[PDB]
Design a protein around this nucleic acid. Structure first.
Ligand SMILES: [Mg+2]
Ligand SMILES: [Mg+2]
Ligand SMILES: [Mg+2]
Ligand SMILES: [Mg+2]
Ligand SMILES: [Mg+2]
Ligand SMILES: [Mg+2]
Ligand SMILES: [Mg+2]
Ligand SMILES: [Mg+2]
Ligand SMILES: [Mg+2]
Ligand SMILES: [Mg+2]
Ligand SMILES: [Mg+2]
Lengths: 315, 100, 95, 52
RNA sequence: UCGGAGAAAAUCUCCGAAUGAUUAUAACCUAGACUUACAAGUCAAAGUAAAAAUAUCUUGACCCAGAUAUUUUGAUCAACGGACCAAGUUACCCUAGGGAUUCCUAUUUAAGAGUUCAUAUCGACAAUUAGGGA
RNA sequence: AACGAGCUUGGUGAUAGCUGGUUACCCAAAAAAUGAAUUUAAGUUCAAUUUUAAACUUGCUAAAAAAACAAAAUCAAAAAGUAAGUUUAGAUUAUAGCCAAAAGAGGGCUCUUCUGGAACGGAAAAAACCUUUAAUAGUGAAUAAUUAACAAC
């Protein structure tokens, strides 16, 4: 009686949600399964508050917000933190770098040109068909001059033969500053080739900060390389080699399904028969067959038969 | 009759199996556990049985539960016992059908 | 049961089994469920579905019915278009 | 007190199912699934089967 | 006969049901299980079909007779696993068997009786591991 | 010369869930009297137990933590001591115990559950208490339990 009462469902609901997150002695479901900037911000807020027209629109519930400006502000101010999560969510860190986490910093931008001025922005988690990505995309990340860099494209999930592998679609090296035409083309551009019926393959675009010019002779690939087998690659080993001069700073990843262009890639240049995959479930569980299925219906005998056609044995 | 726990914690349960029978809600359905007409609890996925306490939140519509829940001491909330089955297999796998 | 008949000296079938059960050549027996035609108005829909089914017999019940019928009811019958043609044999049975 | 009636489909099929009504309540009629027609149709009471 | 509550699962302590009204009318099919001598009785994913998910709350076999045009209905068979349909009586009796044939009293205590005075003769409360008599 | 209904022969080897009886040797294993239905409780059928053969693989004890109510019956990974267990096929008998000890429930007795017992030795005589792995020949030996015990200012 001393304590007050919630008197509202919402107040109880929020309290309950917090408690579940907190650890408990008893088993639970979760176990099993600077200052100047602040002053500047306040000044802008007062100016916005002072504006009668802004208040007039708000009280008329007609006001709106420009998404374009917020998006640019979000990328600069706090976007990388969100960008880190979507990399953690998709498991990029736990795959490429065996659980090591690198916060992206450079707001990297990628887009695939389609015929004319219709660019498909490659954000994080976007969906892009293989047909659109037939040709290499335009990369812009405002490296600034005197800024050595390196760019890498990787499919993460692929390498039909090897499970723990990841093909490199193309690696530009010694990229000096923003401009990318000056990069050394260690690997030419391959079109996306996600096999039919294999789900959503996730492709990522990662950029490393290049401290000093290093010749990646052991990484150079014979251009043109159409011997897919050679495209075998694993970032961890590559990064470890050059970890001294390579530090990641940018991310951009899309996921793509199979498409008719994939058939073209497998045949024309990969020069092999295209593999087809299908989602196969385990056979249903049946208790061991009994000689006398007491009290079981006539369907019982059908569960354990293999062939659906009659046999006649010795007859 | 013979109400009780048909499957004890830690047992490998197959889908459809019945875990417990009750005249009244001694346990509540948890994760991947279904509720029957007679209030019996059965496995919706093949897995391992797990019993765990958890906070209880009722549907907003029902007056009796919202009233009781609302008229609770601000400090803490009531709990209940739940039954869960931990799925032990992947849904399916991809295999090579043919090379064309 | 009649074990030795006065006229023919044989066992006799109990014609109450012949009119209630079907024997599959493998050794199984089928039956109906008692009450499946009775007071259907007060039976639940799930209950009625269970009643309509053809059901198997236990080992001891089958042993009894085998005693009560003669060999002629245990032979292999080659009926054209038989709806139990596929149920006269067991498949994938290790036991 | 109550009686067992036979609701008969008015869709032209012979499908019928038995229901209960109160001797005081008026003659019954309901929408019910007709398997032969595979549609919901009106079932109207035609005959009594027994007094239950 | 079955169900609900206590004893707490062996016999005891209590209430009810042989349904009732409401209704969205609640389909077909099919993994895995519960319960169980047999018999009967429970729960249910997936698929399909209707609609635009939902039935909510608190029980009797087989045979044999019916009714409609496949669909269905028949029990205070309540002795409730139910003989289609049968009561008294015997000391005139018989056979097969099984059995059997509170109040004393002795101890311990001692308020009160006995004019006075507990124990001359007795005697409340009690004490004896104390002896008998629908 | 035995009349509630004569006697004789036949039906007739009437029937009897009841009483009695049921004939050589040796080896081996071995329950119960729990549960269920029954004009059924002097019977029988099923489960359960036991048993014989066969197939192949885990069983018994113990079992943490953690769970279902709670300060031990379910359940029960790894181990460890050990050799059994599941399924298939065939099959009867049994379904009334007895006494001691322990906890309850009714109300001394009487129900229920848990443990043990069935000497040829000891307790006097002693089915049920204690000592005792089977059963053999020996004019060997070490041992177990073992009705006996030592008024008090
Ligand atoms: Mg059964
Ligand atoms: Mg469904
Ligand atoms: Mg009777
Ligand atoms: Mg009875
Ligand atoms: Mg007289
Ligand atoms: Mg005789
Ligand atoms: Mg008898
Ligand atoms: Mg017993
Ligand atoms: Mg019964
Ligand atoms: Mg009877
Ligand atoms: Mg073990």
């Amino acid at each position: 009686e001393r304590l007050e009462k919630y008197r509202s469902f919402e107040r109880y609901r929020r309290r309950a949600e917090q408690e579940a997150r907190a650890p408990h002695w008893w088993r639970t479901y979760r176990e099993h399964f600077r200052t100047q900037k602040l002053l500047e911000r306040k000044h802008f807020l007062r100016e916005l508050r002072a504006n009668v027209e802004e208040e007039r629109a708000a009280r008329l519930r007609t006001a709106s917000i420009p998404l374009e400006a917020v998006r640019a502000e979000w990328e600069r101010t706090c976007g990388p933190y969100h960008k880190q999560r979507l990399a953690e969510y998709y498991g990029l860190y736990r795959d490429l770098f065996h659980g090591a986490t690198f916060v992206p910093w450079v707001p990297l931008h990628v887009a695939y040109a389609v015929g004319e001025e219709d660019l498909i922005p490659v954000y994080h988690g976007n969906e892009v068909t293989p047909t659109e990505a037939s040709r290499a995309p335009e990369v812009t990340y405002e490296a600034d001059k005197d800024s050595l860099w390196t760019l890498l494209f990787i499919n993460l999930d692929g390498h039909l033969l090897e499970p723990d592998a990841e093909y490199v679609h193309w690696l530009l090296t010694n990229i000096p500053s923003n401009r990318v035409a000056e990069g050394q083309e260690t690997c030419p551009y391959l079109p996306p080739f996600p096999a039919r019926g294999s789900g959503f393959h996730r492709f990522a675009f990662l950029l490393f900060k290049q401290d000093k010019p290093i010749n990646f002779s052991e990484d150079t690939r014979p251009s043109p390389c159409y011997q897919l087998a050679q495209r075998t690659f694993r970032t961890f080993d590559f990064y470890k080699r050059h970890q001294e001069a390579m530090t990641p700073a940018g991310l951009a990843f899309f996921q793509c399904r199979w498409d008719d262009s994939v058939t073209h890639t497998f045949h024309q240049l990969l020069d092999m028969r295209e593999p087809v995959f299908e989602f196969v479930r385990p056979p249903p569980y049946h208790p061991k067959q009994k000689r006398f299925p007491h009290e079981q219906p006539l369907r019982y005998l059908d569960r354990y038969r293999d062939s659906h056609e009659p046999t006649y044995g010795i007859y | 009759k013979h109400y009780g726990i048909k499957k004890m914690e830690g047992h490998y349960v197959h889908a459809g199996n019945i875990l417990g029978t009750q005249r009244q809600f001694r346990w509540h359905p948890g994760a991947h556990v279904g509720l029957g007409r007679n209030k019996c609890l059965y496995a919706l996925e093949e897995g391992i049985v797990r019993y765990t306490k958890d906070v209880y939140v009722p549907n907003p519509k029902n007056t009796e539960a919202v009233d009781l829940v609302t008229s609770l001491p601000k400090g803490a909330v009531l709990y209940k016992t739940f039954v869960h089955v931990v799925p032990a297999k992947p849904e399916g796998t991809f295999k090579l059908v043919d090379m064309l | 049961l009649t074990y030795c008949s006065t006229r023919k000296g044989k066992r006799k079938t109990v014609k109450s089994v012949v009119h209630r059960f079907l024997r599959l050549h493998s050794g199984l027996w089928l039956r109906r469920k008692a009450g499946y035609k009775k007071k259907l108005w007060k039976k639940s829909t799930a209950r009625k579905k269970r009643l309509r089914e053809f059901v198997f017999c236990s080992k001891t019940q089958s042993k009894l019915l085998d005693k009560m019928t003669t060999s002629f009811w245990k032979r292999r019958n080659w009926y054209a278009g038989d709806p139990y043609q596929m149920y006269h044999d067991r498949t994938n049975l290790r036991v | 007190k109550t009686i067992l009636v036979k609701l008969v489909s008015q869709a032209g099929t012979g499908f019928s199912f038995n229901h209960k009504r109160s001797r005081l309540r008026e003659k019954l009629s309901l929408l019910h699934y007709d398997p032969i027609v595979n549609k919901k149709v009106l079932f109207v009471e035609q005959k009594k089967i027994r007094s239950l």
